[model samples]
Target chain A: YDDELFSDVQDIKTALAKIHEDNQKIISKLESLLLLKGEVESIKKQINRQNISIHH
Target chain B: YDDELFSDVQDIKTALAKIHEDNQKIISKLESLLLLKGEVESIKKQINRQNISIHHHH
Candidate 1:
């Protein structure tokens, strides 16, 4: 058994856990951005339609 | 005063250390890619110049 390899594995696992948690935070933020993006687009289209109606 | 806040701070430190480590790996890979891109662009320009020379010769 390689002692160094075992140590590397332990480090990798620790890094992986941290990376996973970081990803969770990014994913949570992305969900909020997705919701906001949808809302923004919804109003954007409404504005375009309303402007078109006003002109016509 | 707040136990939960202290626990959160500890967790954040652990996460930050891991993030720092992960960023090092990403930085290493990006540096390699940046070098490779320069090499690729150099080769592409060389090829274009050679092609232009050949056309001029013809």
Candidate 2:
């Protein structure tokens, strides 16, 4: 046995799974931040045009 | 619920933070080594130009 990471078939499978999970979380968080940015920009434009108003 | 790679979520997160921290440390050390190399090179040039030689008694 190499006795290192991915030394065994099961280790290979597990490490791959971990890498995939990490990549997905990174991608998901990026997409979420992007969507949040879009919402902010959309609202900023609306606020600029005075399309949204609050009444007290 | 799917029992898959997500099980290693904590491992990934912890590793990612450590990796990021290590990368920063590596960059700083490289910068320091380069600075030291430059100073040593400058001193070597001085030694070569002066042809400084000393008698060794030990």
Candidate 3:
């Protein structure tokens, strides 16, 4: 019984570690997405300015 | 001793369940980020076209 319990605990520990690593990767990607969002916003403003210049 | 072991197992199980829930939420947010990325790419293309037009007119 003890051996089986130990094995179960080990398996759970491994799964927990893997999930933690995956979470970090997801957070890193999200950070890049935020940066992309800011760049997109800047480009939108630039596009608006260009439209005004073209009309004037 | 058995009872102690059982309690420990229960705690780990709870932690595992919580992590699974969090992972799902993270994945959902990532999906939205992917959609946002697509929109950003489209906007970039539009901006490039506008730049070309302005230069051609100038």
Candidate 4:
């Protein structure tokens, strides 16, 4: 019935939670990747010699 | 899985927690701004009844 996890509406909290969790996970991964991409781009720019610093 | 922090999963948790925390901070700021907006609106709606207001203007 509506009280069961498989039920609709009357008890969909877990489903909703899972959805939110998955969404959050996806957003986190995308953000991390995008940040990494930006870093790579910055490194490329550095290779081309911007206001950059290097160690060694 | 419940007791293990896979490196990837740990990283994900860290990333997500950062987002959640940062968003919360941003949301709090927005909330303050909203409260201020309300105050301004109340001010703007005030009339010459010995009161002044400044709310969203067109």
Candidate 5:
């Protein structure tokens, strides 16, 4: 029973670490999405003059 | 299969939350242990002046 509990504890630790890793991955992607706003703004002049940026 | 996987995911989420809660509890206990060091030291001073306060908190 102790062995089983230890194994479960290890699994829990691994799962927690993976969750942290996944969280970091998601936040990284979110930051990238936010970063694109600036890049899109910089390239807005080269694309078109629809003025869609002004509405939002 | 999809339902099984969904159930497993929910279990994982519940497990993760409980683990997080347990982690906080352990950390709270650890901090309390640290805070007790001063009280222990005071007790030791009033007891017999053994001068034995050289142990790690955790």
Candidate 6:
């Protein structure tokens, strides 16, 4: 019975590790998306300047 | 021994459920970010048109 319980614990640990790995990947992707957002904002500002130059 | 093992299992199940919930929320946020990206692309195209209009005057 104790051996069976140990096996169950091992299985749970494996699952927990997998979920932690997946969460880390998700966090990395989120960071990448945020960086992309920053780049887009920068481009928008550059476009705004171009509009100003054209009007002047 | 069995009782202690059962308690351990319960704790693990709770943790697994919490992580599942967090993963779902992360997925939802990713979808929102993708939508925002699409909107930004649309605005960039609009800006491109303005750029073309200005150059046409010259």
Q: Judging by DockQ against the true structure, name the best candidate.
A: 3
**Whole-model alpha-carbon lDDT for candidate 3:** 0.80
Candidate 3 per-residue lDDT over residues A1-56, each given as its tens digit: 55468777787888788798878878888877778868777887887888788798
* Candidate 3 chain B least-lDDT 10 residues: B31-40
Model 4 DockQ class: incorrect
Write the residue-wise lDDT of candidate 5 on A1-56 in tens digits. Answer: 43235555576678789667655655554554455456445444433432432344
Clashes of 3: 0
Task: Name the docking class for model 1.
Answer: incorrect
- Order of candidates by DockQ, top first? 3, 6, 5, 1, 4, 2
lDDT of 6 at B10: 77
lDDT per residue (tens digit) for residues A1-56 in model 1: 33334554566577677677766655554554455445445555655754565476
For A1-56, candidate 6 gives per-residue lDDT tens digits of: 65567777777888788788878878877776787768687777978889688679
- The candidates' DockQ values read 0.03, 0.01, 0.43, 0.02, 0.04, 0.41
Chain B TM-score for candidate 4: 0.56
| Model 6: CAPRI class | acceptable
User: Scored by CA lDDT, what does every candidate get?
Assistant: 0.58, 0.49, 0.80, 0.45, 0.53, 0.78
Once fitted onto the true fold, the runs of candidate 5 whose alpha carbons sit more than 4 angstroms away are: A1-15, A18-56, B47-58
Model 5 lDDT per residue over B14-58, tens place = 879886676656555555545544554454354332222221211
Under the 3 Å rule for N, CA and C atoms, how many clashes does model 4 have? 7
The per-candidate TM-score of the B chain, in the order shown, comes to 0.57, 0.57, 0.72, 0.56, 0.61, 0.79
Question: What lDDT is reached at residue A43 by model 1?
Answer: 50
For candidate 6, the lDDT comes to: 0.78
Q: Write the per-residue lDDT of candidate 1 for residues B1-58, one digit (tens) a residue.
A: 3566556645756776867787666656544544543554465566556556756775
The C-alpha local distance difference test score for the whole of candidate 1 amounts to 0.58
| Ten-residue stretch with the least lDDT total in model 6 chain B | B31-40
In order, the candidates keep a fraction of the true contacts of: 0.03, 0.00, 0.57, 0.00, 0.08, 0.35
How does model 5 fare in lDDT?
0.53
Q: How large is the i-RMS for each model, in angstroms?
A: 16.4, 20.2, 2.3, 16.5, 22.4, 2.0
> Taking chain A by itself, what TM-score does each prediction score?
0.61, 0.52, 0.76, 0.51, 0.59, 0.80
Winning candidate number (lDDT) = 3
Candidate 3 chain A has its poorest 10 consecutive residues by lDDT at A1-10
Error of 4 at B33 (Å): 0.5
Give the TM-score of each candidate. 0.38, 0.36, 0.66, 0.35, 0.38, 0.73
